[PDB]
Every structure is written in structure tokens, then in C-alpha cells.
Design a protein around this ligand. Structure first.
Ligand SMILES: *[C@@H]1O[C@H](CO)[C@@H](O[C@@H]2O[C@H](CO)[C@@H](O[C@@H]3O[C@H](CO[C@H]4O[C@H](CO[C@H]5O[C@H](CO)[C@@H](O)[C@H](O)[C@@H]5O)[C@@H](O)[C@H](O)[C@@H]4O)[C@@H](O)[C@H](O[C@H]4O[C@H](CO)[C@@H](O)[C@H](O)[C@@H]4O[C@H]4O[C@H](CO)[C@@H](O)[C@H](O)[C@@H]4O)[C@@H]3O)[C@H](O)[C@H]2NC(C)=O)[C@H](O)[C@H]1NC(C)=O
Ligand SMILES: *[C@@H]1O[C@H](CO)[C@@H](O[C@@H]2O[C@H](CO[C@@H]3O[C@H](CO[C@H]4O[C@H](CO)[C@@H](O)[C@H](O)[C@@H]4O)[C@@H](O)[C@H](O[C@H]4O[C@H](CO)[C@@H](O)[C@H](O)[C@@H]4O)[C@@H]3O)[C@@H](O)[C@H](O)[C@H]2NC(C)=O)[C@H](O)[C@H]1NC(C)=O
Ligand SMILES: *[C@@H]1O[C@H](CO)[C@@H](O)[C@H](O)[C@H]1NC(C)=O
Ligand SMILES: *[C@@H]1O[C@H](CO)[C@@H](O)[C@H](O)[C@H]1NC(C)=O
Ligand SMILES: *[C@@H]1O[C@H](CO)[C@@H](O)[C@H](O)[C@H]1NC(C)=O
Ligand SMILES: *[C@@H]1O[C@H](CO)[C@@H](O)[C@H](O)[C@H]1NC(C)=O
Ligand SMILES: *[C@@H]1O[C@H](CO)[C@@H](O)[C@H](O)[C@H]1NC(C)=O
Lengths: 451, 265
């Protein structure tokens, strides 16, 4: 019955990630008062710190031993209370004569490392949770659907509680502070309670199974040998290379659409749950993709998943606006990003099996794969934000105002549609990874022959 | 010809406010927007149609010595025609330096915004000293435009202008509201009320005001100017053209340099 119990673990990370990524800048500029300078600095440093901490926490997990508890479950146990206090505390605005601004940076970086410390073992646990591929893939698909539903939940709850989550605008020319602060605090409290209840229900039942007797129990080296052998392995890098382009394109989309919806080809000044609609459609879709990969999902699932975005998204080439069909396009993109989330993230256990049987004696190297994978996801986030900001700066958007020049529309139209079209095209072309259905069954044979 | 000191009271002026954002501002979007809205609806009675500036009639003027002329000089301000000291009987000089930034209390701001008070009139020595202890003229008509910048309701003082109408019908000035009232001197009596906005008040208040707020930031706290709104005055009655030099303006710019009397024809 543990399948749901493990699946719920994605929500505590995902809801906070979404809430922060969508609201922290607005809160920093408005509810607290920080200059645009320091706001940009805090955001950039927080993301950079997250990327930097990801491999290091991965290493400390790899080094950590099994002492009177789960191999990596004490990491969740150490993370949950401190991370929840940090997430609550960051939202509160400190009243101080001096040094007020640092508080935000410190508690943002600290909460971020703590939540990565939660996430990475939770991602790695899919290998351990059960040995057979069928239940393994079941559990990972369940985790992914609950994670995307966590995205939906976090965005919806924060928006509804704190009021309309819209890009602020400066009307063209030709409700108390403590009350809105208390609103943000209520949001922090309910999201923290969701985090705590999710972590406890997750920890209550997974009861990871310890490793069987290993062929080489002595002489493992965590600092170097793991990295060296992972670099020696080639399908893993081929997989992450193929996944990087797809993930970058779709995160670029999800990021810049927030301003596309108003400034360019937007008949509504408010997104009004459009993002919630597309993400909920993705959450509904993901089980269909799991079953689809049951029915010849070797590589067809990723082909159809990435390719389905192309025609519906490019329907902006016709560009003649009609809001209801545009909503339909958003739903289409929902099922496309559902495939983009579920497939490559859960293909990885097959790669780790192929590496595991290829070289026997190397043991305990599993968390390195997951750590570097989530690190490359964060790196894609960084480069997506960088290209978006650089393009917008270089063309248009000299000032934030309700009226925007025509240039912004050209750059941000081509950016939102054509750049992800070409990016997913190249990624999908380069995505001809080594293991297919034949390869998985062949690895399966050796797996069952080992012990 | 120039209007009578009584006509200065009777004539009505309307004021037009134009708002301009600060380009460098990129923060405090929601609170600055709410503040702009509350300021915008703070002024209930304004000129709806966009005002017209510039010399309008520019005839070779025929005029007598003027009873009141207003002179303002600024570093960088629009210039309007000048009349020498001989022409005007008495003079009020606008001096902006006396104005200082006062804190405009807003509901949602960790650092309260500051605005500049309107300028003040000054007069040469010995012209308004006759107190004569006559406050009772203080009451104006009802006016709903009380606010931070503009308060025609408060009646602190009324003092006589000695150099005008000593024998009878003495003219009183309330400096606090920079407004003036005319009396007729007869035991039996009838007397008019003031318009909501005096022409003299409209002339004096006409300067752009910059709202500033301070935001906590790295390397110390920083000053960000939210926005600034220009104010221009326009007569709302026939004639009443601002004679200034030879020129005859219908309305006055945001910062105006020169000497102006309100006249006819
Ligand atoms: C019609 O005429 C009128 C006048 O005849 C014109 O009105 C003038 O408009 C000017 C527009 O620029 C304006 O000049 C600015 O005035 C600002 C007012 O500053 C006030 O406050 C500061 C201090 O505030 C702090 O006060 C205490 C501590 O002192 C604190 O407790 C508070 O919390 C505050 O934090 C004083 O210095 C002033 O005396 C006022 O009291 C100024 O902010 C501003 O100066 C800044 O900008 C200058 C260049 O832009 C620069 O030289 C100066 O050093 C300041 O620089 C600050 O800002 C930059 C970014 O802006 C920042 O990077 C720096 O770190 C630095 O902090 C100007 O001086 C006139 O005041 C105003 N005159 C009036 C109203 O009488 C009107 O324009 C004109 N219109 C037309 C159409 O002609
Ligand atoms: C230069 O130009 C300045 C700006 O034009 C001008 O400043 C004006 O001065 C008056 C000051 O007079 C006092 O103002 C008090 C304000 O009180 C109001 O607000 C508070 C809270 O906001 C309330 O408690 C009050 O009820 C009121 O709403 C006011 O309380 C005082 O009234 C008392 O005194 C008088 C007698 O003088 C009595 O009749 C009253 O009943 C009461 O007892 C007093 O009026 C300021 O009010 C006015 O708003 C200022 N103008 C503007 C536009 O803001 C300078 O005077 C001027 N100086 C020179 C030398 O020219
Ligand atoms: C007056 O304003 C104009 C417009 O900005 C400016 O070019 C000029 O130099 C100003 N005069 C000064 C600063 O003395
Ligand atoms: C009145 O004004 C005239 C000049 O305008 C001057 O001769 C006279 O002394 C003034 N008297 C007073 C009391 O101001
Ligand atoms: C000023 O007005 C008075 C009002 O009686 C009158 O003597 C004349 O119009 C003016 N006086 C001078 C000296 O200009
Ligand atoms: C003042 O009013 C009375 C009658 O109300 C009249 O006799 C007198 O001429 C008037 N004077 C002026 C200057 O209006
Ligand atoms: C002023 O009002 C009173 C009140 O009716 C009236 O009797 C008087 O004649 C009026 N006088 C003038 C000059 O209007």
C-alpha cells in the first residue's frame, strides 16, 4: 500500500519550489521593501547557491553510512524541521534598524540547501524502495504525478490566499501593510503544515530495504571513484544530454509565459488560472503516459511526448487570436510537459541498472546519479533565466510599464515559440539513447541471474 | 484693462493636474500604485478637459495701473510677460524656497513617502500689517477639496491690506490659504462668498511636486522617487485673462516666471 505513501514525498519540495519561484521577487519588491539591485542579487545568489549545494549534498549522502536507521531516511529526518522553520521564517519580514536585507539572503540560501538535502535522498530512494523494475517504475510514476499535482497545489494555494498573482504594471498616463504581511504569513504557515504532514506520512511507511550481500563490500571511494566511473559510463551522459534541451525549452516556456500572457498576444491582463489549467492537465495526463510506456514505451513515449508540443505550440504561427482555442493549446502543452516531466526523470533507473551490472564491484554509487541529475535540472533553470533576461534586455523592456514597445512582442514571441521548437527538435534528434526495450530485457536477465 | 481687487475675489479658477512616473523606478509597484490612486481621487474638482497654454490674444494692450500683480522667478521655468513695478499697485512674490518636504502618511509603506508643500506668498514690508482685529470674514463657501496640499477650509487669519482701501471697503488677506476677501462698507449689508478655488491660490500653488520614498537596500538604504505631478491653473469664467507683459495667457504653466495681473478684453 506504500505506493501512495512514497508518492506523496514529491509535494513538500515541489510546492515550496513553485511558491518561491513565482512569488519571492514580488514579495521582496512589494511587501518587504528591497531595492531592485538587492532583490536581483538575492535571487541570483539563491539560485546559484542551490546549484552549488546540490553536488556537495549528494557527496555527503554517498559518504554517509547506515547507522541505527535507514541508509538515507535520516537525511529527511534531519532536513524536515529545520527546512520547515526556514521556509516559515523567510516569509516573515524582520523589523530591525540595521542589516535587515541580509536576513532574506541568509534564510533563502539556508532553506534552499535544507530542501535540497531533503530532495536528493528522496529522489535516490526509488532505486532502493523495491528491487523489481515493475514496482520501481510504478512508484516513480506515482511520485511524478504527485509532484506535478504539488506544483498545481502550491501555485493555487499561494495565489488564492495572498490574492491575484499577477505581474504588476504601471498604468499609462496620457488593504493595509500589516494585513498583507499577515496574509503572506498565513500562506507560509499552511505550506509549512503541508510540508510537515507530507514528510511524516512519507516516512511512516517506505521502510527502505537494505542492500543484499555485495560482491565488493570493502574498498569503496566516494570522492573520486564514483565520479570517474560515472564519467566512464556513456549512456547516462547521453540521457542527460538529451534531457537537458527538452527541460530547458519547457522551463523557458513556463517562465516567460507569465509576461507573455499580458504583454504579447494577450487578451487578458490576468492569467486567471491558465497556468493552473495547463499544470492540472499535465497531472491528469501523467498516468496515461505511464500506461503508454507500458504499451511499447521504450522510446516511443519520449518521441510522441516531445513531438506533441510542436504543432499545438506552433499554432501561434497562425497567430490569429481566439481565447478558448488558446486554452485548448494550453491543455495540449499540458500533456506534452507531462510527458517531458515523467519520462526522462524515470528512465534513469534503467541506466543505473545497466551501469551496475556492467561493473560489479563498484557499489553505493547510486546517489551520485540523482544528485548530478537534479543539479543539471537546476543548471538548465539558470541558463533559461539567463537567456531570457539577456534577450529581453537586449531587445525592448528598457523600463517596466504597462504599455510596452512593439520590439518586446517580436522578441518574446519568437523566444516563447520558435526557440523551444528548435530546442526540443535538436534534443529529440540527439535523444537516441542506448537502452531500448530489447536492452532492458537483456539487462533484466543478468539482474535476475545475479542473486 | 485689469480686474478690480473685488474682481480678484469674484473670479473662479480651476486647477489641472498631470501625473508623470519615474522611469528609473522599478520597485514598490503595488504600494506606489495605491498611493497614486489615493492622490488622484484626493482632488475631487479639477479641469477635466486638457488645458491650453500659451499666449492667446496678444493684442496691443490697453490698461490702467494694475491693483495686484504676482511675480515669481525661478531658475528653469517657463517665462510669461513682465510688467514693471510702476504698473501694479501692490505685489505678491511667490518664494518656493520656504517649502519643505513633509511626510504624506500612507497606509502600506514601511518608509513613509514625502512630498513638498506648496510655495508661499511674500509681500513688501508695511503693506499687510494693519490687523484691525477683523477675523469674522474667515468663513468661505463649503469646499470638498481639503487635502495635504490644498486647504481652503482652515481660517486662521484675516488681515487688512493697508495700501488698499483704507477709508472703506477694506480688503483682507488670509496668508494661510493665500486667499483674499473684499468687503463693502455699509451698515445695511449684503456680501458674496468666495469661489472654491481663488485665482491667487491657483497662481501660487502651481509647481510640480515630487514624491520620494526610501527603500532598504544593500550598501545602505536608498532614495527612490515614485512620481511627480504638475499643477496648472486655468480661469473658469469669461475673460479673466492673465495679462502679463504684452502677452495675455489663458492658463499658466507648471513653473511660471514673470509678473501677471488678471484682466479683461
Ligand atoms: C519647478 O520648480 C521646483 C523648484 O523651484 C522644482 O522642484 C524641484 O525638483 C527637483 C527634482 O530633482 C528636486 O530635487 C530633488 O530633491 C530631492 C528632495 O530630497 C529631500 O530629501 C533629501 C533627504 O531625504 C532624507 O531626509 C532625511 C535625512 O536627510 C531622512 O530621514 C529621510 O528619510 C530622507 O531619506 C534632502 O537631501 C533634500 O534636501 C530634500 O529634503 C532629492 O532627493 C534630490 O537629490 C537627489 O538627486 C540629485 C540628482 O538627482 C542628487 O544631486 C542628490 O545628491 C540626491 O541623490 C540621491 O538620489 C540618487 C538617486 O535619485 C541616489 O542614487 C543617491 O544615493 C542620493 O541619495 C533632488 O535634490 C527639488 O527638491 C525640487 N524643489 C522643490 C520642490 O522646491 C520642479 O522640478 C520645477 N518643475 C518644472 C517643471 O520646472
Ligand atoms: C506658508 O504656506 C503654508 C502652506 O500653504 C502655510 O501652512 C498652513 O498653516 C496652517 C496652520 O494652522 C493650524 O493648522 C492646524 C492643522 O490642523 C488640522 O489638522 C489636524 C490633523 O491633521 C486636525 O487636528 C485639525 O482639526 C485640522 O484638521 C490646525 O489644527 C490649527 O487650527 C487651530 O488654530 C486656528 C487658529 O489659528 C483655530 O481657528 C482652529 O479652530 C484651531 O484651534 C491651525 O489652523 C495649516 O493648518 C494649513 O493647512 C497650512 N496650509 C496648507 C496648505 O497645508 C503657512 O501658514 C504659510 N506661512 C506663511 C508665513 O505664509
Ligand atoms: C533647464 O532645462 C533644460 C532641459 O533639461 C536643460 O537643458 C537646461 O540646461 C536647464 N538649465 C540649467 C540646468 O541651468
Ligand atoms: C504703498 O505702495 C506705494 C508704492 O506701490 C508706496 O509709495 C507706499 O509707501 C506704500 N505704502 C505702504 C503702507 O505699503
Ligand atoms: C492703489 O489703490 C488705491 C485704492 O484706493 C488707489 O489710491 C489707487 O488705485 C492705487 N494707488 C496708487 C498710488 O497707485
Ligand atoms: C454697498 O452696499 C450698499 C447697499 O447694500 C450700497 O449703498 C453701497 O453703494 C455699496 N457700496 C459698494 C462699494 O458696493
Ligand atoms: C442682501 O440680502 C438681504 C436679505 O434678503 C436683502 O434684504 C438685502 O436687500 C440684500 N442686499 C443686496 C445689496 O443684495
Amino acid at each position: 500500500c506504500n505506493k501512495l505513501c512514497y508518492a506523496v514525498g514529491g509535494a513538500p519540495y515541489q510546492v515550496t519550489g513553485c511558491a518561491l519561484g513565482f512569488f519571492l521577487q514580488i514579495y521582496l519588491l512589494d511587501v518587504a521593501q528591497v531595492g531592485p539591485f538587492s532583490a536581483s542579487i538575492i535571487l541570483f545568489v539563491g539560485r546559484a547557491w542551490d546549484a552549488i549545494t546540490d553536488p556537495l549534498v549528494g557527496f555527503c549522502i554517498s559518504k554517509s553510512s547506515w547507522t541505527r536507521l535507514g541508509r538515507l531516511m535520516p537525511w529527511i529526518i534531519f532536513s524536515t524541521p529545520l527546512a520547515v522553520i526556514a521556509y516559515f521564517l523567510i516569509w516573515f519580514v524582520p523589523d530591525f534598524p540595521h542589516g535587515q536585507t541580509y536576513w532574506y539572503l541568509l534564510f533563502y540560501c539556508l532553506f534552499e540547501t535544507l530542501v535540497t538535502c531533503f530532495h536528493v535522498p528522496y529522489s535516490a530512494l526509488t532505486m532502493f524502495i523495491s528491487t523489481e523494475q515493475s514496482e520501481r517504475d510504478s512508484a516513480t510514476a506515482y511520485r511524478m504525478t504527485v509532484e506535478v499535482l504539488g506544483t498545481v497545489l502550491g501555485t493555487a494555494i499561494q495565489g488564492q490566499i495572498v490574492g491575484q498573482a499577477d505581474t504588476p504594471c504601471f498604468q499609462d498616463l496620457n488593504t493595509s501593510h500589516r494585513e498583507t504581511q499577515n496574509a503572506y504569513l498565513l500562506a507560509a504557515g499552511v505550506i509549512a503544515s503541508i510540508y510537515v504532514i507530507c514528510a511524516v506520512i512519507l516516512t511512516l511507511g517506505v521502510r527502505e530495504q537494505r542492500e543484499p550481500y555485495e560482491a565488493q563490500q570493502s574498498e569503496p571511494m566516494s570522492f573520486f571513484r564514483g565520479l570517474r566511473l560515472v564519467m566512464s559510463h556513456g549512456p547516462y551522459i547521453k540521457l542527460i544530454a538529451g534531457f537537458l534541451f527538452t527541460s530547458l525549452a519547457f522551463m523557458l516556456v513556463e517562465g516567460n509565459f507569465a509576461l507573455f500572457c499580458t504583454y504579447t498576444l494577450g487578451f487578458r491582463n490576468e492569467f486567471q488560472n491558465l497556468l493552473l489549467a495547463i499544470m492540472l492537465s499535465a497531472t491528469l495526463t501523467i498516468p496515461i503516459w505511464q500506461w503508454f510506456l507500458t504499451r511499447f514505451g521504450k522510446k516511443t513515449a519520449v518521441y510522441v511526448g516531445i513531438s506533441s508540443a510542436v504543432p499545438f505550440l506552433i499554432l501561434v504561427a497562425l497567430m490569429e487570436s481566439n481565447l478558448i482555442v488558446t486554452y485548448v493549446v494550453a491543455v495540449a502543452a499540458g500533456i506534452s510537459v507531462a510527458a517531458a516531466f515523467l519520462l526522462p526523470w524515470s528512465m534513469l533507473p534503467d541506466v543505473i541498472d545497466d551501469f551496475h551490472l556492467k561493473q560489479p564491484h563498484s557499489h553505493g554509487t547510486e546517489p551520485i546519479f540523482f544528485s548530478f541529475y537534479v543539479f543539471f535540472t537546476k543548471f538548465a533553470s539558470g541558463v533559461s533565466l539567463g537567456i531570457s533576461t539577456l534577450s529581453l534586455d537586449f531587445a525592448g523592456y528598457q523600463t517596466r510599464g504597462c504599455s510596452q514597445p512593439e520590439r518586446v512582442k517580436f522578441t518574446l514571441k519568437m523566444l516563447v515559440t520558435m526557440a523551444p521548437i528548435v530546442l526540443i527538435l535538436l534534443g529529440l534528434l540527439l535523444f537516441k539513447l542506448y537502452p531500448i526495450d530489447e536492452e532492458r530485457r537483456r539487462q533484466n536477465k543478468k539482474a535476475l541471474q545475479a542473486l | 484693462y485689469p480686474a478690480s481687487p473685488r474682481e480678484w475675489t469674484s473670479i473662479e479658477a480651476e486647477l489641472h493636474i498631470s501625473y508623470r512616473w519615474d522611469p528609473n523606478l522599478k520597485g514598490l509597484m503595488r504600494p506606489a500604485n495605491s498611493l497614486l490612486s489615493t492622490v488622484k481621487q484626493d482632488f475631487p474638482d479639477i479641469r477635466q478637459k486638457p488645458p491650453i497654454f500659451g499666449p492667446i490674444f496678444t493684442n496691443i494692450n490697453l490698461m490702467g495701473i494694475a491693483p495686484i500683480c504676482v511675480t515669481a522667478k525661478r531658475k528653469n521655468g517657463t517665462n510669461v510677460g513682465t510688467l514693471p513695478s510702476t504698473v501694479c499697485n501692490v505685489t505678491f512674490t511667490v518664494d518656493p524656497n520656504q517649502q519643505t518636504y513633509q511626510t504624506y502618511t500612507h497606509n502600506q509603506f514601511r518608509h513613509q513617502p514625502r512630498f513638498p508643500k506648496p510655495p508661499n506668498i511674500t509681500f513688501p514690508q508695511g503693506t499687510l500689517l494693519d490687523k484691525s482685529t477683523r477675523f469674522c470674514q474667515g468663513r468661505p463657501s463649503s469646499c470638498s477639496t481639503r487635502n495635504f496640499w490644498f486647504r481652503p477650509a482652515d481660517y486662521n487669519q484675516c488681515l487688512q491690506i493697508s495700501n488698499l482701501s483704507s477709508t472703506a471697503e477694506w480688503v483682507l488677506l488670509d496668508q494661510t490659504r493665500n486667499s483674499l476677501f473684499w468687503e463693502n462698507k455699509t451698515k445695511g449689508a449684503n456680501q458674496s462668498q468666495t469661489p472654491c478655488v481663488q485665482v491667487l491660490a491657483g497662481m501660487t500653488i502651481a509647481t510640480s511636486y515630487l514624491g520620494i520614498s526610501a527603500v532598504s537596500e544593500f550598501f545602505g538604504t536608498s532614495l527612490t522617487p515614485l512620481f511627480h505631478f504638475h499643477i496648472s491653473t486655468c480661469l473658469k469664467t469669461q475673460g479673466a485673462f492673465y495679462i502679463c507683459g504684452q502677452s495675455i495667457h489663458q492658463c499658466l504653466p507648471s513653473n511660471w516666471t514673470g509678473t501677471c495681473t488678471i484682466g479683461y478684453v
